[PDB]
Design a protein around this ligand. Structure first.
Ligand SMILES: Cc1cc2nc3c(=O)[nH]c(=O)nc-3n(C[C@H](O)[C@H](O)[C@H](O)COP(=O)(O)OP(=O)(O)OC[C@H]3O[C@@H](n4cnc5c(N)ncnc54)[C@H](O)[C@@H]3O)c2cc1C
Ligand SMILES: Cc1cc2nc3c(=O)[nH]c(=O)nc-3n(C[C@H](O)[C@H](O)[C@H](O)COP(=O)(O)OP(=O)(O)OC[C@H]3O[C@@H](n4cnc5c(N)ncnc54)[C@H](O)[C@@H]3O)c2cc1C
Lengths: 401, 401
């Protein structure tokens, strides 16, 4: 930890990192460069309460645990020279650094087939995006969502509540193909279908002509607006240009170190080890952005602290469904607690591999999720009969370990 | 480049690296730790002339361009402490380092289904392996090879020349699935089949009982010996334990830097950017081991030197077939020069992507390979008609650029 600290990006990962630096006891200079001209804010409300209600002052990140930080908002870092230890800014200034931290996140993938479209086509990542989409979410208007990931599905629910007609096109045979158990994805499709979402599986966009979207089965979908949510790509251009190892994401170890000395990276921009799978992965979760930012800061200030070690997990709020998912989507066995039903949805899934818990899902069952994450963290091997039995208290089981 | 230099592993990558350090002008200490108790040697002859003729003194690497190096042969590096800058050795000694270089290569993957086998099962990576296999390559004996990669196929040819009966089992529908054009792989299968190799495609080993190998189609193969060649796994255990980013291979940038300061890696142990695909890959080629070792050394001594930038390529000598392959296995177009025929095999393949050469293959046409690699390196876009036309001289075409 060499002063001064410069952080590129002013999202959740950055805010979490800088607050932890200060809390851990680092009092040297911190400067954060943020390309969006916005008070740092949280993104999940953009598909939900902000989309529905439009108050950005409800979604700002709390920066008060990060005192004495200069936030350069509306400024783009254009390059860094890792030999000179400088960052070149879009406003013509240069920042010196002792330690450089890349927290630049990821940007929505565009749809190459809609590149020359004339009808409104948006992605949903920023406050600017959300405002632009909202301005067109008229009751009885027709929205097409491309991509059946959590963001698209969150938007689908919000749009339906607002009285917007929703069609959704997914290239895969299922929704949430990235990190959701099949049982969950199947149920989620049944739910959205029941709420009026027109789901198209195993279809891809091939183009558009004058307010109509074209599919690879040779059919058409009319829409007033398309929102594209087919995933993100790491914002790793500065790292690539400066000679760091990256591949749609900057490779980091558990300390957040890149291949370039004095340069760290954290959050959505990173490709990191998933301890459960043992493989490198770009983890895109809110929990990772916060916790990885915190762990990297803690170890920078206190080198005796352990590296980042958390197992991945996320939530997704989709209308009546409060979904929580931890760990791996599958193992050699899935245990189901409760009925899987559209009538008052409430259930839990537990994924086991050789007797060990490797993943869990809770739908409208937050109470069970925390204990399951604890059991997951220690690689617990509980009695499978007990895991299935509705009389079992999971909090009691997690406490017994 | 901080002295002293310690290199772990004494294979081709290591030898190439240390020779380049000396040639580039570094005269500080160099110590190489090599777990095999063997004068450093080259591996390709192990499937060919060494297997056939058995003289290890024909296959030693020339270390004379690496004067004043202490080679600790028959010694295993057990751990390194990247804070203390020390390496712990199996003989009880500790080495200090200014710069640590991990050149530990990769080890054959074992077949989990043959783990408890009673019949002879070998892999082919080391001189010890090759000697052990040779001692059983009796004329008219029955060899089963698992895996249709270049090493297995090289061994298949050598065994057939020696009068050994050869069966080969491949899980994929084709041979050389890793980095060979389909046209090449198809031809290679026809060739080996014509030489008496019993090829089994889309079959996997499920086990063995008393000198018989069992397959997943529910059938049996009797063999006097099994040689397993289903790929390798990076020898990255020391890196993993020391906190470096790795995923079946140590992630490095074009300077050979790992995520740990003062620790570099090169050769088969590394996962690195393939500039053609733009993706990270563990490149397993002889050319990579040598050239990446050389490039990393050059840049350590002269930081103004460029990073490693070579495009991947390999050869494979399979009986009558002298195969050379560069770049990507496919593009949007393949051009074929010559007839593809078992009668005096001689042909060239050129892979193009949007008019640009992205790959080439030569079979018994070494003359054409060097020019094609030059055209590949610059991303040349030659006339497709000219590329097809047998009157075209490729050396003249590469010279014109
Ligand atoms: C609509 C939406 C809904 C979501 N809902 C959920 C959910 O239900 N569950 C869940 O787990 N996650 C949710 N996510 C939250 C998401 O997980 C977090 O926003 C993300 O993980 C935070 O990561 P980050 O801070 O690394 O990146 P970011 O939030 O992307 O921040 C990086 C910042 O750096 C900026 N930047 C990039 N390059 C430069 C440069 N060169 N110079 C200066 N600045 C630069 C970017 O523009 C950006 O502002 C949702 C996200 C969106 C967009
Ligand atoms: C049978 C065979 C045939 C081949 N034919 C071809 C071919 O036709 N075309 C082609 O391109 N390539 C061929 N290859 C050559 C291959 O490409 C090279 O041998 C390889 O790329 C060299 O890489 P390396 O030096 O990084 O690793 P290695 O050669 O594996 O050397 C690493 C050395 O480090 C040692 N080591 C590992 N851990 C430790 C430790 N902790 N302490 C001390 N030492 C350690 C290993 O035991 C090993 O001796 C063939 C290889 C084999 C085995």
């Amino acid at each position: 930890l060499k002063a001064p600290v410069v952080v590129l990006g002013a999202g959740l990962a950055s805010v979490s990192f800088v607050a932890e630096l200060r809390q851990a006891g680092y009092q040297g200079l911190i400067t954060v460069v943020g390309d969006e001209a916005e008070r740092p804010y949280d993104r999940p409300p953009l598909s939900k309460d902000f989309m529905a209600h439009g108050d950005a002052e409800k979604i700002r990140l709390d920066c008060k645990r990060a005192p004495e930080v200069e936030w350069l908002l509306g400024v783009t870092a254009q390059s860094f020279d890792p030999q000179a230890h400088t960052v070149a800014l879009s406003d013509g200034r240069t920042l010196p650094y002792g330690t450089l931290v890349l927290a630049t996140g990821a940007a929505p993938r565009a749809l190459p087939t809609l590149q020359g479209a004339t009808m409104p086509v948006h992605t949903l990542r920023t406050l600017e995006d959300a405002r632009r989409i909202q301005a067109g979410l008229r009751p009885q208007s027709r929205l097409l969502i491309v991509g059946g990931g959590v963001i698209g599905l969150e938007l689908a629910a919000t749009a339906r509540t607002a009285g917007v007609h929703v069609s959704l096109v997914e290239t895969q045979p299922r929704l949430m193909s990235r990190a959701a158990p099949a049982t969950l994805a199947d149920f989620v499709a049944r739910y959205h279908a029941a709420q009026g979402v027109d789901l198209r599986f195993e279809r891809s966009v091939t183009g558009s002509v004058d307010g109509v979207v074209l599919l690879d089965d040779g059919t058409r979908i009319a829409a007033d607006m398309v929102v594209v949510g087919i995933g993100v790509l790491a914002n790793d251009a500065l790292a690539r240009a400066a000679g760091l190892a990256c591949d749609d994401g900057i490779f980091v170890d558990a300390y957040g170190r890149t291949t370039c000395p004095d340069v760290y990276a954290l959050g959505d921009v990173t490709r990191q080890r998933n301890p459960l799978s043992g493989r490198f992965e770009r983890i895109e979760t809110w929990s990772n952005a916060q916790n990885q930012g915190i762990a990297v800061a803690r170890h920078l200030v206190d080198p005796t602290a352990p590296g980042y070690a958390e197992l991945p997990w996320y939530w997704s709020d989709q209308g009546a469904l409060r979904i929580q998912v931890a760990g791996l989507a599958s193992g050699d066995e899935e245990i189901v607690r409760g009925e899987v039903s559209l009538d008052a949805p409430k259930f839990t899934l537990i994924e086991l591999q050789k007797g060990r818990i490797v993943g869990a899902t809770c739908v409208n069952n937050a109470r069970d999720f925390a204990p399951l994450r604890r059991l997951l963290a220690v690689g617990a091997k509980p009695d499978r009969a007990a895991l299935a039995d509705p009389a079992t208290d999971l909090r009691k089981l997690a406490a017994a370990v």
